Design a protein around this ligand. Structure first.
Ligand SMILES: Nc1ncnc2c1ncn2[C@@H]1O[C@H](COP(=O)(O)OP(=O)(O)OP(=O)(O)O)[C@@H](O)[C@H]1O
Length: 773
């Protein structure tokens, strides 16, 4: 209840307000990214988080209100930029201003040291944990603005000082060529000081991506609030007075009349009189968004190709996640990563804002098939091009290349010009080779859809196999347990663990205005908790539930589980329509396995049974959309997405078998239909197998199974007859109530007790209710 409130926790900014959520459960509405962007950190008292400037006991976490709204509503006296040690992604150096420019009179006097001591009257209260004496002992002087300090005789500015950061390691790390440093400290201790988290970085205040950013006030919900990025957004199509004024909280994505604020908008036609705050952001944009954002040689060639890469990464083509229909630029939810280390099995979970700082050499990212590799690579490329995340400023060039058979060993220049630039980039082989060589650790390749060394081109092969004479940094997307070739070559392997539920609920929240469907999904989901995992193993379930809104709400209020599963399966069928032949096999071949276990009462499904089922024979991609490597001690197990998914896949296999006219691919279906042989078997199996063999409009399969249900005959006795006939009539009326019933149910099952025991659909009653009922 009561914990040490104290005061401003000066040791707590973002990128440290996010790392505190590794001890946070993955099932709740608000996200660590959004909560941390609100200046909150996870103490761990029971479940709650508190702010770093205005300590708040915020435990309850609702859905209709974002953390910014709660923080403003409860204690509104800490967000007037009165002073907060807010660090953004914050590459720790971006302050490069005045390398030799106008200081406040050169308070170091260009010689003196006690002058550096005395220049710190207005040293703010953000730091202070850092002693001004130790800062001044290394030739540092306070330039005057926002706790950034400049060192003379080399003119280097460092900011975002935190607790315990000794300004002697850092002065060595960021400027080895600082004359004062070589004058005082020997060339031996500096190598020891090099040991830090950034790989090979140097003085990189000059770089073609830079864009100075403000104090990153917490009213910045997420990216796209820098008022300079949003301006160059709409230099493409909204160019043929209105434009510059539209940047009162807007940016362009789409077809010249769909311009989006941080929530949504554009539902009005432009070029009329039309003041941009029209209808005050059209009806406040429901919930009065952010108080109107709070009241408003060949170096030339490589720079030119840098500009083209930035332009083609900011084009509307790349930033499109949740690629179903809509108008999307607002998603920033990240994927959790835990990086296994080369030698021993240590997990060591990372965070997205900190993983960028460790990019050193050839890197691989794991991940289940359809789990967010292409998205993550596109996000990092975009964030480089959308230059406001500072950590990515160290790369002068980034390249996204999908090695999906477009590369039969032809050449790197040809593959980079025809995939990224487009009709404009004539970057020659020699130009690209020289750019790679001189820009050693400032070129980041993002390779996707990996196959193997044999398929890479010559230059890419050299860059991936040596990484000694080139120093280029690469990130390759691969499949889990399918990266067995570059084990010896890579450092800092990475893996996409899972997709937590807060990301799913955040994406659901953003896409919807009628936010009663999402809450219904929340309640109707934590009551099962058996399919808690698996279903959210991939972001494709979010896309499936979103595209289920092509007809109505995703909470149709009628046995939600079967609709959810069918929506998922239909979305799988839709996405891979280009290569649907193996998927149709993967759903069938794997699906039959579930049927084999539907009645044998086993869900572990060890490896040797998979061969009998007839799936994974080629270790193919899609077979991981429906199973996971649950255990890896020995003889890895293969568990599906919960017993309910057992049921649904077994049902779809049974329907396909009893629907196919292949005679002896159907006798097996009848055999699997045979084991149900008693009313208790018509209950215990059909408690969970009821709406799954019936849901599908199995025209051919309906008569055989309804006949089998009828032929079982050869209070509790009467009761089971009543339930059995209820099942049979419901099943037969689900799809077609003409062919099978008029010749089948007229035989045996007709019973009722008082008035409404046979209140089903009304047709011609029997002669006299089976002559005995
Ligand atoms: N943060 C996110 N929010 C919502 N959906 C996401 C997010 N990240 C990824 N996705 C979803 O992930 C899907 C793409 O996944 P992914 O790139 O893993 O497929 P893939 O088969 O690995 O493709 P490739 O093999 O080409 O990399 C997209 O349809 C997108 O909807």
């Amino acid at each position: 209840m009561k914990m040490k409130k104290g005061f401003n926790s000066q040791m707590r900014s973002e990128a440290k307000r996010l790392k505190t959520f590794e001890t946070y459960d993955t099932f709740r509405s608000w996200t660590p990214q959004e909560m941390a962007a609100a200046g909150f950190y996870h103490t761990g008292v029971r479940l709650g988080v508190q702010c770093f400037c205005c300590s708040l006991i915020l435990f309850g976490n609702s859905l209709r209100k974002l953390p910014i709204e709660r923080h403003k509503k409860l204690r509104p006296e800490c967000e007037f930029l009165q002073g907060k040690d807010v660090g953004n992604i914050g590459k720790y150096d971006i302050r490069v201003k005045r390398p030799e420019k106008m200081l406040r009179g050169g308070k170091a006097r260009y010689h003196e040291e006690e002058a550096r001591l005395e220049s710190f009257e207005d040293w703010p209260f953000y730091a202070h944990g850092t002693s001004p004496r130790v800062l001044s002992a290394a030739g540092f002087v306070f330039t005057g603005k926002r706790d950034t300090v400049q060192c003379f005789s080399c003119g280097g500015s460092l900011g975002n000082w935190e607790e315990g950061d000794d300004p002697w390691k850092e002065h060595a790390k960021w400027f080895p060529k600082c004359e004062f440093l070589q004058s005082k400290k020997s060339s031996e201790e500096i190598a020891q000081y090099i040991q830090s988290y950034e790989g090979f970085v140097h003085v990189t205040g000059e770089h073609f991506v830079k864009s100075w950013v403000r104090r990153e006030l917490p009213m910045v919900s997420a990216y796209c609030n820098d008022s300079v990025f949003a301006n160059e957004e709409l230099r493409m199509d909204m160019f043929k007075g209105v434009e510059a004024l539209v940047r009162a909280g807007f940016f362009y994505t789409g077809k010249k009349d769909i311009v989006r604020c941080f929530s949504c908008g554009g539902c009005l036609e432009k070029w009329a009189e039309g003041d941009d705050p029209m209808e005050d952001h059209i009806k406040f944009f429901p919930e009065c968004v952010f108080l109107q954002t709070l009241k408003s040689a060949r170096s030339l060639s490589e720079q030119l190709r840098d500009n083209y890469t930035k332009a083609t990464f900011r084009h509307m083509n790349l930033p499109e996640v949740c690629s179903s229909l809509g108008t999307d630029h607002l998603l920033s939810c990240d994927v959790s990563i835990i990086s296994k280390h080369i030698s021993q099995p240590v997990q060591e979970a990372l965070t997205i804002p900190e993983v960028f700082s460790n990019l050193n050499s050839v890197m691989c990212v794991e991940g289940e098939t359809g789990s967010g590799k292409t998205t993550f690579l596109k996000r990092i490329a975009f964030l480089w091009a959308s230059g406001c995340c500072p950590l990515l400023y160290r790369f002068q060039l980034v390249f996204y290349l999908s090695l999906s058979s477009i590369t039969p060993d032809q050449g790197l220049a040809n593959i980079i010009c025809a995939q990224l630039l487009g009709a404009g980039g004539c970057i020659s082989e020699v130009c690209l080779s020289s750019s790679i060589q001189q820009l050693q650790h400032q070129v980041l390749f993002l390779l996707d859809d990996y196959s193997g060394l044999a398929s890479l081109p010559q230059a890419l092969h050299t860059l991936i196999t040596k990484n000694y004479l080139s120093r280029t940094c690469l990130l390759i997307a691969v499949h889990t347990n399918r990266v067995r070739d570059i084990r010896l070559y890579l450092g800092t392997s990475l893996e996409i663990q899972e997709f937590p539920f807060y990301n799913t609920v955040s994406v659901l929240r953003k896409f919807f205005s009628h936010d009663i469907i999402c809450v219904e999904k929340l309640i109707i989901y934590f009551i099962d908790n058996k399919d808690l995992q698996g279903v959210y193993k991939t972001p494709l379930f979010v896309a499936a539930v979103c595209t289920d809104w092509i007809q109505n709400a995703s909470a149709q209020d009628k046995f939600q589980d079967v609709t959810l599963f069918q929506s998922y399966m239909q979305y799988l069928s839709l996405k891979y329509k280009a290569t649907a032949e193996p998927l149709q096999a993967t759903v069938s071949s794997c699906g039959q396995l579930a049927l084999t276990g539907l009645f044998s009462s086993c869900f572990e499904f060890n490896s040797d049974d998979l061969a009998e089922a007839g799936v994974d024979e080629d270790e193919k991609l899609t077979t991981l959309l429906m199973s996971k490597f649950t255990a890896q001690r020995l003889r890895p197990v293969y568990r599906f997405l919960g017993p309910l998914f057992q049921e649904f896949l077994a049902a779809v296999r049974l329907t396909e078998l009893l629907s196919s006219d292949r005679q002896e691919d159907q006798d097996l279906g009848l055999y699997y239909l045979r084991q149900i042989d008693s009313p208790l078997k018509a209950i215990n199996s059909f408690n969970i197998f009821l709406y799954y063999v019936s849901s599908h409009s199995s025209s051919k399969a309906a008569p055989t199974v309804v006949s089998h249900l009828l032929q079982l005959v050869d209070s509790s006795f009467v009761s089971e007859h009543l339930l059995r006939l209820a099942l049979i009539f419901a099943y037969e009326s689900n799809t077609v109530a003409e062919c099978s019933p008029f010749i089948l149910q007229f035989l045996r099952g007709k019973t009722l007790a008082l008035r409404v025991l046979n209140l089903q659909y009304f047709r011609d009653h029997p002669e006299s209710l089976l002559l005995l009922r």
